[PDB]
Design a protein around this nucleic acid. Structure first.
Ligand code: ADP
Ligand code: ADP
Ligand code: BEF
Ligand code: BEF
Ligand code: MG
Ligand code: MG
Ligand code: MN
Ligand code: MN
Lengths: 487, 479, 487, 479
DNA sequence: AAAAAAAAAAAAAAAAAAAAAAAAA
DNA sequence: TTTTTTTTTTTTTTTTTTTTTTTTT
């Protein structure tokens, strides 16, 4: 189910620009072998597969470098076009295609994606809808039957991103987050934290304004009380004048009237003309914002605990697969087994400037659980990442047989290579009994190819080598011509 | 035995160099090949019929090739004459080589007991010139490689004809081919077995094939039904289980022999049966096979334990079940070792280190123990210190977050936000795509509290405003 | 002529705690092949060499994971030591022994660098004087003749921290300012930037301080003017009417007097006592700091330009070597050569939040200078990084000929591997005259070792493998069992 | 002249089978030269073929190269022609390390016409636990007598191979390609001995075959002339692909040294540009006469060394278009060398069409090398090495001065505002040299407070323009 | 075809931690 | 010899800018 059939790479990386240089690669079952010299566009095929399936460029690069460079091609712009023909989960043939352009705008290279086409054959008619990127991605996900994160990380993992299971806690958590299809809830966590942080900044601002206003309130109340006192003295002077009936007291009353009118003018100053309500309302706003901030802290902590509990629950099932695979395919006597352990932060809060993520894979040497990341071997790391990817494919992707290993035996020794080949043979034999399974393997070693081809024999492989014009050529060769490329 | 008996020492899947780099498992396949050659020499067989897979590696190392060549020079070469002749044209059967004649037909080599062989799936022609290890042996003048397929479209199996007295053999060879390809040729009738025209029905048709026999894949196996009816026996080769006894086919009435590998290449529960090599005796059109045990191959003992199938000492919960399963497996391994020791009596050539395997199926929820601390017990007592024990087995975020929010609202005290109010905002955010649900709810509650506090004319006191908002939250949530 | 000689590892990574598993490795010349299974101690030996030479732990790991784990060792504390015996540039025997203690407490392990030893012969002195970390590092740097950066990056490069030439702009810039010994000037650059940013945040605070001081000054000047006018009115009325209205005059006098005294007491409040002086002083400070900020920005820009010019001045020669090495080693006619290009940002300011660095390795594909990072294959990246390291070794490492290549033939095809073997053989042949070259190839490829053994023959190689209790014993094997370990 | 007392030995060395076997142009190139060597041996009716090692380029030869070597050896080395010389020495010592110590033609099951006595080179040196080489495979197959292999690393004792034809006695000493460091140690330590014949040590030609380095810049890693056995009469010396096959005596050594050279251009060094030849040694009692024979099947090699410093008339340094001139000169050189190859080709008809052409350029006075990827795309189909056509090879900057220059230039270009001229340059110099965490914020502090202080004491009105005007006036009084 | 607003990432920046240096005791 | 205090480095989470995408105009 969900088997890829054909590809047409044009204008991507070292592949040529004109139609004459558009290369076609047909994927075999159950094992497709890609060989060739360094460069030459072997990984570029996996990059095109990932881009047409999901729309994501290889890690560390954007569309500016993915497309053939217009400066190298000596053209003002370069138009690339990848077309993939595959069968969906039900079995219908689909011929999705994606187009991009990389124009040369002065020194920089401007990139733009054209509208792709979906071609679903129906009753002998090949429709062609010029859908946009969002519809293209939705249709690819619904046809291949697997999520975008799975296609990105488990199936079409880039060569430079192949060791993603042994990244830092944040990156590993995000990867297993999008894989577990729970990224909307962490987006909710993110907006919760951002709202608390903005509210905390607003609370801080309100408190300096509060300093300035309390002073205004005190000044207004002091001058109001003094105005009342002067009015009382004016009334007393008037009473004394009445008692006499005193011109000195009349002048005193006149001066008191002048004081009263001048201070009533002072009260009318917009600085504290209505400070009584303004200060009260702004203090109320500060207090209510800080109370909501406390509630946001509590809810952020609760949601974080819920999300990690969900992560641990989802990982509990695939941990058994990881353990079994590590026990079966690790020839060394170092690590009994490995698993992924996620630990929530008990002291987490939305006011934290920097968070602490405890997502990790652990090497259990003996009975003590060590941290595999950092202290693991290079070959151990390669094998661990490969085992994690294989278990992830076994668990989630049952409607997408494809798995695509870009040089799986990178740092593995002789016996680990043999065990990995044996494991891949077992995976092919188990998964190809009922549904189609494809195991695209770009490689540069010919003892791995022999071990893989002993069972489920391959008959035709692909030689991907450059030509005179320095484009990339995808040619098909029989097994008899296999040793000329691999080492 | 007489002048017409065609004694053929049939052997198959003698892998060479299997675990050659292994200190304890090395120099074992060479010993088995030495024993096979000794059996052939002592029994004075006419020739040796190898079923393929004579070399484990596709490109055999220097040590394995050198040892094989030394053994062939020691045994296969001799002054004894050959008592049978070849009636087929050797320019076709062995026409791939630049010397297209049988090794004893060459005047530069004095071959006593020739070795006819086919190529298995481990050593098949690969390369620009399509060379195999058996081709190296044939070029050296030791092994007659026959039955190679010379086409990728149609397989015409031209036989090599042998005559000893009145007994005639039409030896057919078919090297191992990608199983799906051979199946697709069999179903499409693209394979034809050429037969000798003279004396058509007096040839003892023998077929040697290196293909999967059991249920491996939909196209990754060759059923016996597709083989031609005119064959009399069919040695089979790719299957390492020892089935030297010829079996009757009720559908086509041709015998089938499965010599099986000499060495235990895989730890499947099919190699536990003792390995024997055949001794074919052919008189006219009558076949008699006498098996000879191999005393130079270490015994392979394996048992299957299903913990879920033993609900008597393995309770699923059982907080101390790890020790129980470890002890049970310990007794199993010890019993296997004792059986190996007790069978080793009377055999001075079988290496003193049995191959022990123990597959465990914890389908019932049990957890595996340390294979890495349960093998240290048998580091020096088994020939496979690593593969002693094999372990194998045969919720929505919305509900979890809802239950967590439900526990939180009832476990802690909310200052201002209403009971059960964020949780329905987060669900709106993640389900209705509204990217400002949290902000809108927070601002709404903020504005409502501010308006109520303004309306009631609270003083600018922290305790008073806290009490007021607490009472507002505790009274307005009812309706 | 620094020549490493022998070195002992105890308690580091997986090497045993007791002083019985103290593995000793004697480095041969000019080729020292290290082989073994995945795990073992192959890269740990290079890690120990780098730690002895410089004191820097492997990347991604602090001292907590470098030492043998106390939990795995089943001990409360683990004592590790590495003793390297070598010769310095003057050909005198030196032996340095560093120590460390993990001393795990509670759940979180700790670390502590014990005092080292500088055991060195002086007429048979063998003085084992104890030295601090700084003294150890300075002595090792002085004796080996190569700086800490060269030892960390060119000579002893960790497997994980390889392809560092193909890193981001800032990372590459700060690896060639430590190789070019310009770290002090860039620390001064960062000091200038920090000072400028601090003065800018003082100026931003002074904005609102000046606003409020201006408001206070306007209030104070208004009340002073109203004081002077009231006093003038009081005295004018006094001397006009003092020369019935007579007592009305006196009442007006007392009113004016109370107005004057209250106004004067309002003046003596701190916010208005002298606001002109405070406003002037704050304006003076603000303007002075703004002008100093302008000068600091100018000086930061010119010092950044000077640093970039010095980097280019060294990089032109290093690239002159790199071009030849790449054109002699790379077996592919698609990249004409490579070089490292850097240029200062045109609009660079000390107030910028993010400063973009443009230090990169550029592939010259055809006639255009593309950037290697982001659009190079794994094999081209590996070869370019190895060639850049080799070029830096010829330029900077002329008094130290150690160069540890940890699995150089990774993601390299057959032709490039043969060419790399030829280049390494030529390097050994050319750099072994009047000096002592020492290569530390640690590979898992039989073919690469067999190509390296035809010239500059290997008589003995070191095989690192685990023992019964997983201790990574180092065993010395003559060349009669090499194939037992290589793939 | 040949008679019953004339040893006709064909001397070949460094055949290097399997060199670039996967290259389309030069794949089968080596098995054509080997075929020509064997054909020369057969048509000259030589007694035996003596090889100086390096018969196989790869240590573990692939299936194709080994198979082709076996094919050629079986075709030519094997025949019904009887051998004419006998080995009057115990074959269990010189032909040791094998389970069949007897010579290949002394086997009763082998019909060898022209035996081959070969030593092992450094490319195919014995590796493995059993210490086997490809020569051991060839010996076990019964084609080549591998002799002269070292026994132990403690000391080497070269056991002779005593063979004679009538009145001509020749002792065939042989030494494998031991690492050249061990051989220097083992010579200065005198831990080496050549066992002389047990009797009549006067009538022995004492032909010694060695495969080691020779006079070169690697003084530590080579065996110098003399410094060897003094009673030798011919030391064939391989591992030197330059052909010096003419036996030339030195000033005082009393033994001829022959350097047959390789039969294929493995490296592109100028030494291999010379024509390759074959030995055809003839020995009559004690007389030596070696007649070189050209190898027509060897691909032509043309190397020219040019340096750009010694051609100043055309290659002018500091020229706008010197690169175009260099490219034109290199193109003319390539064209002239290709035309020379074409002219030399028509003298025969066996040389491969595409010659090996390469020149090295030594730009040292300052030159930009041209794009070697565009010079050599004009030659995809006219040179056997399309990539290695052009080789390019060759043969203060204080930070303080640069930063001081930039500081003074910036100060002269743009005027400052408050900071004193030249102060912060010395401030940062003190920061760097004296490594103290000051002098930057302190220079700023000092200067800010001096200026602020003055601006107040002078009673300056708080406005915008006047304050900066007076701070500028105060700044100008520094000079 | 154009504007401007926003989503995404990658590469520079900053928090936090943990060990070393110091600087008091 | 111990303890506390501040300093400096590093790992890794965070923020910033820029470029492409999407929506309107
Ligand atoms: N934007 C681009 N324009 C032109 N060539 C490119 C571009 N990006 C990469 N390349 C080149 O295209 C090739 C792609 O290599 P890749 O397919 O990753 O190699 P491999 O197949 O060995 O893994 C390399 O030669 C690379 O330098
Ligand atoms: N802190 C540690 N404690 C114990 N074992 C460790 C520790 N760190 C690493 N190891 C193990 O020690 C070995 C070190 O690996 P390394 O020497 O880097 O491998 P390689 O030589 O294969 O490159 C691995 O087996 C690793 O799992
Ligand atoms: F994992 Be090891 F370094 F090959
Ligand atoms: F480096 Be490439 F992917 F072979
Ligand atoms: Mg790749
Ligand atoms: Mg490593
Ligand atoms: Mn078999
Ligand atoms: Mn040689």
């Amino acid at each position: 189910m969900s088997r890829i059939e054909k590809m047409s790479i044009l204008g991507v990386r070292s592949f040529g620009i004109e139609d004459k240089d558009k290369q076609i690669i047909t994927f075999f079952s159950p094992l497709t072998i890609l060989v060739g010299p360094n460069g030459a566009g072997k990984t570029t095929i996996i990059e095109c597969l990932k881009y047409i399936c999901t729309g994501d460029f290889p890690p560390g690069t954007k569309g500016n470098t993915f497309v053939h460079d217009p400066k190298v091609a000596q053209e003002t712009d370069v138009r690339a076009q990848i077309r993939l023909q595959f069968r969906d989960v039900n079995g219908e043939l689909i011929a999705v295609q994606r187009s991009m352009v990389c124009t040369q705008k002065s020194k920089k290279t401007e990139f733009k994606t054209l509208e792709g086409v979906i071609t679903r054959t129906k009753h002998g008619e090949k429709v062609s809808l010029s859908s946009k990127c969002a519809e293209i991605d939705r249709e690819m996900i619904s046809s291949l039957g697997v999520s975008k994160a799975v296609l990105n990380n488990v199936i079409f993992c880039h060569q430079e991103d192949s060791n993603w299971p042994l990244s830092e806690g944040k990156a590993l958590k995000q990867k297993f987050d999008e894989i577990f299809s729970a990224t909307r809830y962490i987006k909710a966590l993110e907006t919760l934290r951002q709202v608390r942080q903005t509210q905390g900044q607003k609370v801080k601002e309100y408190q300096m304004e509060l300093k300035y206003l309390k002073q205004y309130k005190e000044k207004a109340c002091e001058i109001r009380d003094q105005i009342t006192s002067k009015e009382a003295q004016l009334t007393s002077s008037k009473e004394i004048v009445k008692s006499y009936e005193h011109n000195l007291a009349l002048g005193r009353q006149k001066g008191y009237e002048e004081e009263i009118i001048h201070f009533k003018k002072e009260l009318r100053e917009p600085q504290f003309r209505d400070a009584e309500e303004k200060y009260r309302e702004m203090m109320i706003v500060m207090r209510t914002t800080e109370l909501v901030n406390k509630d946001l802290d509590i809810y952020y902590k609760t949601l974080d605990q819920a999300i990690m509990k969900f992560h641990s629950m989802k990982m509990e099932e695939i941990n058994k697969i990881i353990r079994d695979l590590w026990r079966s395919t690790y020839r060394g006597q170092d690590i009994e087994y490995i698993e992924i352990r996620s630990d929530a932060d008990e002291n987490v809060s939305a006011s934290d400037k920097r968070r602490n993520y405890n997502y990790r894979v652990v090497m259990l040497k003996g009975d003590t659980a060590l941290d595999m990341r950092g202290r693991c071997s290079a070959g151990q790391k390669v094998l661990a990442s490969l085992i994690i990817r294989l278990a992830l494919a076994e668990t989630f992707c049952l409607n997408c047989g494809i798995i695509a290993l870009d040089e799986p035996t990178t740092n593995l020794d002789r016996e680990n290579i043999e065990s990995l080949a044996h494991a891949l043979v077992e995976i092919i034999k188990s998964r190809s009994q009922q549904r189609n399974f494809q195991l695209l393997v770009i490689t540069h070693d010919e003892d791995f190819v022999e071990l893989l081809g002993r069972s489920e024999y391959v008959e035709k492989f692909y030689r991907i080598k450059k030509n005179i014009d320095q484009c990339s050529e995808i040619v098909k060769c029989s097994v008899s011509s296999l040793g000329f490329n691999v080492h | 035995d007489d002048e017409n008996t065609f004694k053929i020492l049939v052997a198959t899947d003698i892998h060479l160099g299997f675990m050659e780099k292994d200190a304890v498992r090395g120099n074992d396949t060479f010993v088995t090949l030495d024993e096979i050659l000794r059996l052939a020499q002592e029994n004075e067989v006419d020739f040796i019929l190898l079923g393929g897979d004579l070399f484990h590696e596709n490109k055999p190392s220097r040590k394995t090739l050198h040892t094989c060549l030394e053994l062939l020079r020691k045994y296969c070469m001799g002054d004894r004459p050959v008592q049978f002749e070849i009636l087929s044209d050797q320019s076709v059967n062995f026409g791939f080589s630049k010397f297209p004649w049988v090794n004893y037909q060459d005047g530069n080599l004095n071959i006593s007991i020739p070795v006819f062989s086919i190529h298995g799936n481990h050593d098949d022609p690969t390369g620009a010139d399509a060379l195999c290890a058996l081709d190296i042996l044939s070029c050296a003048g030791f092994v007659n490689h026959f039955g190679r397929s010379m086409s990728v479209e149609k397989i015409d199996i031209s036989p090599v004809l042998l005559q000893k007295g009145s007994t005639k053999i039409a030896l057919y060879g078919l090297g191992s081919i990608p199983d799906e390809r051979l199946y697709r040729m069999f179903v499409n009738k693209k394979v034809t077995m050429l037969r000798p025209k003279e004396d058509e029905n007096s040839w003892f048709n023998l077929f040697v094939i290196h293909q999967n026999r059991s249920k491996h894949g939909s196209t990754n196996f060759i059923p016996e039904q597709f083989l031609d009816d005119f064959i009399d026996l069919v040695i089979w080769g790719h299957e390492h289980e020892c089935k030297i006894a010829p079996t009757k086919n009720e559908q086509q009435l041709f015998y089938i022999s499965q010599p099986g590998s000499s060495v235990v290449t895989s730890l499947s529960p099919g190699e536990a049966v003792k390995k024997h090599v055949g001794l074919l005796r052919i008189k006219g059109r009558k076949m008699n096979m006498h098996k000879i045990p191999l005393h130079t191959v270490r015994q392979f003992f394996m048992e299957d334990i299903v913990l879920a199938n033993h609900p008597d000492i393995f309770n699923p919960d059982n907080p101390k079940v790890t020790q129980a399963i470890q002890s049970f497996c310990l007794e199993k391994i010890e019993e296997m070792l004792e059986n190996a020791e007790r069978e080793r009596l009377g055999n001075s050539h079988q290496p003193e280190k049995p191959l022990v395997r123990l597959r465990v199926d914890y389908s019932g929820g049990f957890e595996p123990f340390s294979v890495l601390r349960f093998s240290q017990k048998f580091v020096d007592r088994v020939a496979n210190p690593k593969d002693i024990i094999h372990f194998f087995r045969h919720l929505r975020v919305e509900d979890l977050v809802k239950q967590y929010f439900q526990t939180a609202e009832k476990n802690v005290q909310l200052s201002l936000l209403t009971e059960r109010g964020m949780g329905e905002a987060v669900q709106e955010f993640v389900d209705k795509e509204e990217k400002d649900a949290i902000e809108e709810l927070v601002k709404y509650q903020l504005e409502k509290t501010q308006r109520f506090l303004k309306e009631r004319h609270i003083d600018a006191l922290e305790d008073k405003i806290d009490e007021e908002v607490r009472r507002f939250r505790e009274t307005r949530q009812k309706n």
